[PDB]
Amino acid sequence: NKYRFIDVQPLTGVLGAEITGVDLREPLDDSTWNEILDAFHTYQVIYFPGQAITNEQHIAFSRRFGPVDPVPILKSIEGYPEVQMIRREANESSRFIGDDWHTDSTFLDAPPAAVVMRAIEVPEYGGDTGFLSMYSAWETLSPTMQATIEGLNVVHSATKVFGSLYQATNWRFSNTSVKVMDVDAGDRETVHPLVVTHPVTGRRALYCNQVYCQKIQGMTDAESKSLLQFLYEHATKFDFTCRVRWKKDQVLVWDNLCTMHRAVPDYAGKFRYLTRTTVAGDKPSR
Amino acid sequence: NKYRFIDVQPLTGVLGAEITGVDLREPLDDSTWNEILDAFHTYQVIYFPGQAITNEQHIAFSRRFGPVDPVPILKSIEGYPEVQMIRREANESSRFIGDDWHTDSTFLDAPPAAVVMRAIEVPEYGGDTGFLSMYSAWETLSPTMQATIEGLNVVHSATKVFGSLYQATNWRFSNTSVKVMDVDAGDRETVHPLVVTHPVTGRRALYCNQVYCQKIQGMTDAESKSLLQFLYEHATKFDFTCRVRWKKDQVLVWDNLCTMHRAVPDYAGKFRYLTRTTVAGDKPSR
Amino acid sequence: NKYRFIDVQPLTGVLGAEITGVDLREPLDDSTWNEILDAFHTYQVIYFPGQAITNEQHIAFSRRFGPVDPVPILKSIEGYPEVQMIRREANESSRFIGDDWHTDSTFLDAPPAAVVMRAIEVPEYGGDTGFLSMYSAWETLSPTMQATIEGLNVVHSATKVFGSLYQATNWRFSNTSVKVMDVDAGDRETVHPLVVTHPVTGRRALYCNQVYCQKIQGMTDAESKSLLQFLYEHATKFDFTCRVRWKKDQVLVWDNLCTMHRAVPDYAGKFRYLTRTTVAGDKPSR
Amino acid sequence: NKYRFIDVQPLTGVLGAEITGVDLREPLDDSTWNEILDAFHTYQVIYFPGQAITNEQHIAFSRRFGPVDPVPILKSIEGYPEVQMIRREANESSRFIGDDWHTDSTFLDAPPAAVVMRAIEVPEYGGDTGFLSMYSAWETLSPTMQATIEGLNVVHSATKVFGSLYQATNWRFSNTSVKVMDVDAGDRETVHPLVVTHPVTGRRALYCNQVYCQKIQGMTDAESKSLLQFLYEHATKFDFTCRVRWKKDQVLVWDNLCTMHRAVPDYAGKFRYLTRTTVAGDKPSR
Ligand SMILES: C[C@@H](Oc1ccc(Cl)cc1Cl)C(=O)O
Ligand SMILES: C[C@@H](Oc1ccc(Cl)cc1Cl)C(=O)O
Ligand SMILES: C[C@@H](Oc1ccc(Cl)cc1Cl)C(=O)O
Ligand SMILES: C[C@@H](Oc1ccc(Cl)cc1Cl)C(=O)O
Ligand SMILES: O=C(O)CCC(=O)C(=O)O
Ligand SMILES: O=C(O)CCC(=O)C(=O)O
Ligand SMILES: O=C(O)CCC(=O)C(=O)O
Ligand SMILES: O=C(O)CCC(=O)C(=O)O
Ligand SMILES: [Cl-]
Ligand SMILES: [Cl-]
Ligand SMILES: [Cl-]
Ligand SMILES: [Cl-]
Ligand SMILES: [Co+2]
Ligand SMILES: [Co+2]
Ligand SMILES: [Co+2]
Ligand SMILES: [Co+2]
């Protein structure tokens, strides 16, 4: 709109934008990179159709957003530790990775700031990714509700994904993309604010997710359950979401602090493979 | 035990006490009155079996607790505007008065401080009254949850009892004990703190009830519902309750700021009649 | 793929398809019509980008699906009582029409079978419509849960939209697209099965929606709320939805028996105008 | 009332009765035993104040109700395997036994029919036992709701009490009354009807409890959770309960099929000791 070096097409009135008119196989001039970063901060999830980039170009483009660092759970392609896989063979019957709303690796003291995902080979239909804005979840709380919860922190851990709760369950991820982890690493706790300030935009976002949040720190289990449940229902209303469909060589970047996302498992029996590099963040803070 | 002019038998480890060794038809000396008042403050609901008092002695004893003032909704006995009736004819099929956890007349800017209820004729069994302590409901919230809610206020009105919500439904009280009221008086709102300090003991109590609380002030309807539902489920756990069985001429006093009570409707087809005088309070405050 | 006279691009693995290779301004031969109808039955919501049709061609094409009959609540365009408007002026501050999951006019003894909606002028982004499959909501109930509910009926009425519950609240639709209605018509109840069989495909679908369903027939209010809340949370999981973005002259048909839909209100301050003709149905049945 | 050999004083209009005018240290003539059994079947929980019986008289009186057989979890007094203890030392800080609504040992293929509990040494106040009627929970379901759930079965196991869920938790029972159990015995599942017919009275009772019920058989976890939650809330309404206060040598009998009960933990710091013998039952059936 204001953009002169890239073409940007917002996806909904809440978040998401398609970006075209740029070739990510080539270096970006300063002005072009500035518009891309501005679109990233405005729209929170941006995607570029039709970008046939090499793995190393994927690494370098990811590096423009900040330091790259893989997440603990995913396997990487041979010869690139930074390039992890979200790969599901046609014949799998295991749990689909990321099939509840979450944001990535929040059990870390410093979760990722962003992730850059690229479609290698995906079905003609099925396997969309949903996103939602945690800026919008926060802004649509009343001032009274905001003031009530803004001093709270939450305890996060990977116990349901690769810790003792996981090991107690029957339903596994396959070993196609997921590593065997140490149970104790799965159960290690960290604490983050329930309401964070984005370190670049200064905007505030609600920060909780059902995959990694165990409870509100200092609360009883029943108090915490009641509050977190309301927040999850509030944040995942359909009005705050968008939905991204993938095609081969679509490159997408999401902000891992101010958004949540989830896989859509509607392609059972079909091969699906995307790669991703993760961009490191600093300690979430209030 | 520490009591030397009255005999006090606590009812549970949470609230409630029977008081004997005293004849309420006779004046009470300062020593005996000081212990009764102390037992009222410690136990929150106190009752005196076997007190065959006149209506005037009921008014005079009620007056020892504070100025007496009837509640808006109840009919009074002929010749005593201060002595109101909780009366249900055997064959009534209407709603049972007070059959949800509440405390009285909290839609008033200044609800009653206490009520003094006396059994005239009651069933051999059935018609007990439940009580619970809102001191205990407050004290068993975590320090974190207490800090989270202590600054909130709640909007109260009588809309479901004698205002527009009542008029919209089809389940009525009979005219045995309940007056016809103005709908606009039913709908008038007041605001009270969600957490109050008792003006005599200085102790804090949770202050919300599903009968008169409409919503948390300043919150959205979904936010208010979520928090108030948790607080009602928390406060009405069986562990925080006691149950009083009535016998003819039992006289009982409850603190209308720090308890809630409810009628038990398990005597359909049997006559029940109690009288009560209400003791005025000041504006609930933090 | 099996389609040889139209090109069909399914939208997700659950429901929804784009149809191209056809010009709806021209008559359709039997072969092309049979495939369109087949795609409508398989995919439940179908849409045709780029169809600059007249209002008469919109009526004629709608008529191929079944007899056309407007819904009670919407204003129609001058000169075409069958062509109703979903129109929102940029500066409206009123409630957004259809902004909760529902299916249309289910308070009728015989709700519509289908609707055909056409974009006249819509925002560059914002104003998408969500859809979900009630075939999928039904199929993913366990066999045990299916047997448990299949004999139940639900009482429907328009009370919250244009009856006494609507009149009691303070959030209105504007008069741009919505007629003034009789309150007694708003409150009139009908009964439908909770689980219906589609009269053409023979497949079964869950049939309840929070906008028009009042309660499960024969149940208490607390029993009905409990079951209907579970079914709404089950049916509206993100996995069962698809999301359609509009562009000028996109024409879309949805099956009003086996889907639910909702408006997304993310375009406040921007003009939006679609027209629709509704296709009459028969009484929903087991 | 009709009783001529015993004096019976019902406790509420729902369940419970005090029985006097009999000495349980002596054998009962046929007529006296017939009235006691009739009062047991009518009132579901009966209690006899002031019965200073020996352990063997307790055994023999229990034997009149049917075969005696201890429950798996509780320690017994030396020299009487049939006489188990519910004993809590003044200094305990562990979990209170039986502090949620339940009925006993329903993880067994044939749970107890009844239990006979006798106060040895109890506090002056605190440590009441609540009871409720599952006949009343069932009768207050609508016919429609009754027909909906009457064919369902439920899976029960002791996993939360002495199985893997217990071992996962932090909060233990003390070893004062509770035995060390095998985890596998804790996790063994059985199936009972959700609605049972009492084998003597022929009356129907709802049969589920949060302590031992894992899920509705054949349902998904979310479907089962939703239904069981509603039933627990419905059954434990205060209106369906009574509350029994203990005094030394009170002997009480409860029907373990048609009632639920729970301990009240309001006596922290005070010694409490009751003994009990359990009477074996047959397989719950519909
Ligand atoms: C890769 C990603 O891992 C998951 C996130 C959510 C869920 Cl449900 C499962 C996994 Cl493995 C992450 O958290 O970084
Ligand atoms: C007497 C009492 O009135 C009621 C309280 C609760 C309920 Cl559910 C009904 C009434 Cl009339 C009061 O609030 O003063
Ligand atoms: C046009 C449509 O009307 C509505 C549907 C849902 C809602 Cl929330 C509002 C309206 Cl006016 C209908 O039911 O036919
Ligand atoms: C003795 C009794 O055991 C319990 C019942 C409920 C609860 Cl919460 C705990 C126990 Cl040990 C039983 O089930 O037979
Ligand atoms: O497969 C997808 O769409 C998303 C998976 C995901 O959550 C992730 O990669 O962290
Ligand atoms: O009838 C009872 O037990 C209590 C009635 C009541 O709530 C009241 O008098 O305010
Ligand atoms: O405006 C929309 O997207 C849908 C409106 C709707 O629900 C309807 O026309 O019935
Ligand atoms: O201690 C009590 O009041 C009851 C304990 C109990 O549930 C039991 O003995 O099975
Ligand atoms: Cl390269
Ligand atoms: Cl006065
Ligand atoms: Cl027609
Ligand atoms: Cl003996
Ligand atoms: Co993820
Ligand atoms: Co009252
Ligand atoms: Co609609
Ligand atoms: Co027990």
Give chain A positions within 8 Å (CB) of B147.
151
Give chain B positions within 8 Å (CB) of A148.
148-149, 151-152
CA–CA dist A241, A128 (Å, integer): 12
* Residue D211 exposed, middle or buried by CB count within 10 Å (0-12, 13-18, 19+): buried
- Among A7, A45, A128, the strongest candidate for a mutation testing the C interface, having the largest count of C CBs within 10 A, is A128
| Subunit partners of chain B (3 or more CB pairs within 8 A) | A, C, D
Q: Which protein residue has the closest C-alpha to ligand 3 atom 8?
A: C98
Across the A:B interface, residue pairs with CB atoms under 8 Å apart total: 58
In the numeric block, which tokens belong to residue D245? 């206060």
Is residue B203 part of the annotated active site? The answer reads no
**Range C232-261 burial, b when 16+ CB lie within 10 A, else e:** bebbbebbbbbbbbbeebbbbbbbbbbbbb
Cα Rg of chain D, angstroms? 18
- Of B69, B71, B67, B7, whose CA–CA distance to B36 is shortest? B7
**CB neighbours of residue D90 within 10 Å:** 11
CA–CA dist B28, B17 (Å, integer): 19
3-state SS, A209-241, equals CCCCEEEECCCCHHHHHHHHHHHHHHHCCHHHE
C115 to chain B, minimum CA–CA distance in Å? 32
Q: How many residues does chain B have?
A: 286
- Of D237, D274, D281, whose CA–CA distance to D252 is shortest? D274
Q: Which protein residue has the closest C-alpha to ligand 4 atom 11?
A: D97
> Is the CB of D105 within 6 Å of ligand 4?
yes
CA–CA dist B236, B241 (Å, integer): 7
Given strand B129-133, what is the order of strands in its sheet? B241-244, B129-133, B259-263
The alpha carbon torsion through B264, B268, B269, B275 (nearest 10 deg) reads 30
> Which stretch of DSSP H or E encloses residue A37?
helix A30-43
Q: Which chain A residue has the Cα nearest residue C9?
A: A125
- Residues β-bridged to residue C114: C255, C279
**Range B114-150 burial, b when 16+ CB lie within 10 A, else e:** bbbbbbeebbebbbbbbbbbbbbbbebbeebbbebbe
Q: How was it solved?
A: X-ray
Cβ distance of A10 and C267 shorter than 8 Å: no
Phi–psi pair at C231, nearest 5 degrees: -70, -35
Residue written as tokens 């949800």? B100
CA–CA dist C192, C198 (Å, integer): 13
- Of A138, A139, A131, A125, whose CA–CA distance to A253 is shortest? A131
**CB neighbours of residue C174 within 10 Å:** 15
What is the CA(D225)–ligand 13 centre distance, in A?
Answer: 27
Angle at B209 between CA B206 and CA B211, to 5 degrees: 170
CA–CA dist A285, A110 (Å, integer): 10
- Residues β-bridged to residue C281: none
> Cβ contacts of residue C285 below 8 Å, gap of 6+?
C193, C196, C197, C199
Give chain C positions within 8 Å (CB) of A12.
125-126, 128, 264, 266
Q: Active-site positions of A?
A: 102, 104, 261, 276
Residue written as tokens 């035990």? B1
Ligand 7, residues at Cβ distance < 6 Å: C 86, 97-98, 104, 129, 261, 263, 276
- Contact indicator for C239, C14 with CB cutoff of 8 Å: yes
Residue written as tokens 């670049």? A200
Q: Which ranges of B44-112 does DSSP label H, i.e. alpha helix?
A: 55-63
Cβ distance of D9 and B130 shorter than 8 Å: no
Q: Classify the phi-psi angles of B127: left when phi > 0, otherwise alpha if psi is within -120 to 50, otherwise beta.
A: left
CA atoms within a 13 Å half-sphere pointing along the CA-CB vector of B197? 7
> Is the CB of B98 within 6 Å of ligand 2?
yes
Q: Which of C156, C192, C262, C276 is catalytic?
A: C276
CA–CA dist C231, C223 (Å, integer): 13
CA atoms within a 13 Å half-sphere pointing along the CA-CB vector of B22? 25
> Is the CB of B231 within 6 Å of ligand 2?
no
- Of C190, C196, C193, C191, whose CA–CA distance to C258 is shortest? C196
- Residues lining ion ligand 11 (Cβ < 5 A) are C 67-68
CA–CA dist C68, C27 (Å, integer): 18
B200 to chain D, minimum CA–CA distance in Å? 25
Where in B109-203 does DSSP place strands (E)? Answer: 114-121, 129-133, 153-156, 190-193, 195-197
In the numeric block, which tokens belong to residue C109? 């003894």
Which atom of ligand 3 has the smallest separation from the CA of C278?
A: 14
Phi–psi pair at B183, nearest 5 degrees: -55, -40
One-letter amino acid of B275: T
Phi–psi pair at C169, nearest 5 degrees: -95, 180
Distance of CA A273 to the CA centre of its chain: 17
> Which stretch of DSSP H or E encloses residue D186?
helix D183-187
**Three-class secondary structure of residue D102 per DSSP:** strand
- Of B283, B279, B272, whose CA–CA distance to B253 is shortest? B279
CA–CA dist A190, A197 (Å, integer): 18
One-letter amino acid of B185: A
Which atom of ligand 3 has the smallest separation from the CA of C107?
A: 13
> Cβ contacts of residue A157 below 8 Å, gap of 6+?
A107, A163, A186, A187, A188, A189, A190, A212, A214
| Subunit partners of chain A (3 or more CB pairs within 8 A) | B, C, D
- Of B120, B113, B92, B146, whose CA–CA distance to B265 is shortest? B92
3-state SS, C166-219, equals HHHCCCCCCCCCECCCCHHHHHCCEEEECEEECCCCCCEEECCCCCCEEEECCC
What is the CA(C277)–ligand 7 centre distance, in A?
Answer: 12
- Contact indicator for A258, A135 with CB cutoff of 8 Å: yes
CA–CA dist B45, B94 (Å, integer): 28
Q: Give the C-alpha distances (Å, rounded to integers) separating A213 from A178, A193, A223.
A: 21, 11, 14
One-letter amino acid of B37: L
State whether the Cα torsion A67-A71-A76-A81 is positive or negative: positive
Which atom of ligand 4 has the smallest separation from the CA of D100?
A: 8
Q: Which chain B residue has the Cα nearest residue C165?
A: B168
CA–CA dist D255, D203 (Å, integer): 13
Q: Give the C-alpha distances (Å, rounded to integers) separating B70 from A6, B25, B58, B105, B281.
A: 74, 22, 13, 10, 12
Q: What is the DSSP letter of A68?
A: B
One-letter amino acid of C43: Y
Superfamily of domain A1-286: Clavaminate synthase-like (3.60.130.10)
CA atoms within a 13 Å half-sphere pointing along the CA-CB vector of A259? 27
Residue written as tokens 């069985």? B245
Give chain D positions within 8 Å (CB) of C141.
223
What is the CA(C98)–ligand 3 centre distance, in A?
Answer: 5
- Of A64, A188, A195, A210, whose CA–CA distance to A141 is shortest? A195
- Of A221, A198, A183, whose CA–CA distance to A282 is shortest? A198
Cβ distance of C219 and D149 shorter than 8 Å: no
Q: Which chain A residue has the Cα nearest residue B226?
A: A230
CA–CA dist C137, C223 (Å, integer): 21
Q: Give the C-alpha distances (Å, rounded to integers) separating A239 from A132, C127, C258, C262, D161.
A: 9, 10, 22, 10, 43
CA–CA dist A160, A153 (Å, integer): 19
CA–CA dist B234, A113 (Å, integer): 39
Q: What is the DSSP letter of D233?
A: H
In the numeric block, which tokens belong to residue C202? 């023979």
> Which stretch of DSSP H or E encloses residue B243?
strand B241-244
What is the CA(B282)–ligand 10 centre distance, in A?
Answer: 14
CA atoms within a 13 Å half-sphere pointing along the CA-CB vector of C196? 24
Q: Give the C-alpha distances (Å, rounded to integers) separating A187 from A166, C75, D242.
A: 10, 59, 43
Strand D129-133 and strand D259-263: the pairing is: antiparallel
- Contact indicator for B284, B192 with CB cutoff of 8 Å: yes
Given strand B190-193, what is the order of strands in its sheet? B190-193, B153-156, B213-216
> Cβ contacts of residue D263 below 8 Å, gap of 6+?
D96, D97, D98, D99, D127, D129
Q: Classify the phi-psi angles of A50: left when phi > 0, otherwise alpha if psi is within -120 to 50, otherwise beta.
A: left
Q: What is the DSSP letter of C282?
A: P
One-letter amino acid of B90: A
Which atom of ligand 1 has the smallest separation from the CA of A86?
A: 1
- Residues β-bridged to residue A10: A17
Q: Which protein residue has the closest C-alpha to ligand 5 atom 6?
A: A98
Distance of CA C44 to the CA centre of its chain: 10
Phi–psi pair at A167, nearest 5 degrees: -65, -25
**DSSP-assigned states of every residue in C107-166:** TSSS--SEEEEEEEE--SS---EEEEEHHHHHHTS-HHHHHHHTT-EEEE--HHHHSHHH
CA–CA dist C5, C8 (Å, integer): 10
- Of A234, A274, A267, whose CA–CA distance to A250 is shortest? A274
Which member of B143, B216, B227 has the closest CB to residue A218? B143
- Contact indicator for B84, B228 with CB cutoff of 8 Å: no
In the numeric block, which tokens belong to residue B91? 């064959």
**Range D74-89 burial, b when 16+ CB lie within 10 A, else e:** bebeeeeebbbbbbbe
CA atoms within a 13 Å half-sphere pointing along the CA-CB vector of C131? 26
- Contact indicator for C246, C138 with CB cutoff of 8 Å: no
Cα Rg of chain C, angstroms? 18
CA–CA dist A16, B216 (Å, integer): 34
Give chain B positions within 8 Å (CB) of D267.
13
Strand A45-48 and strand A17-20: the pairing is: parallel
Give chain A positions within 8 Å (CB) of C11.
125
Cβ distance of D239 and B265 shorter than 8 Å: yes
**DSSP-assigned states of every residue in A164-214:** HHHHHSSPPPPTTTB----HHHHH--EEEESEEE-TTT--EEE---TTTEE
In the numeric block, which tokens belong to residue B159? 């809309």
For chain B, report the end-to-end CA distance as a whole number of angstroms.
33
Distance of CA B178 to the CA centre of its chain: 17
- Contact indicator for C35, C6 with CB cutoff of 8 Å: yes
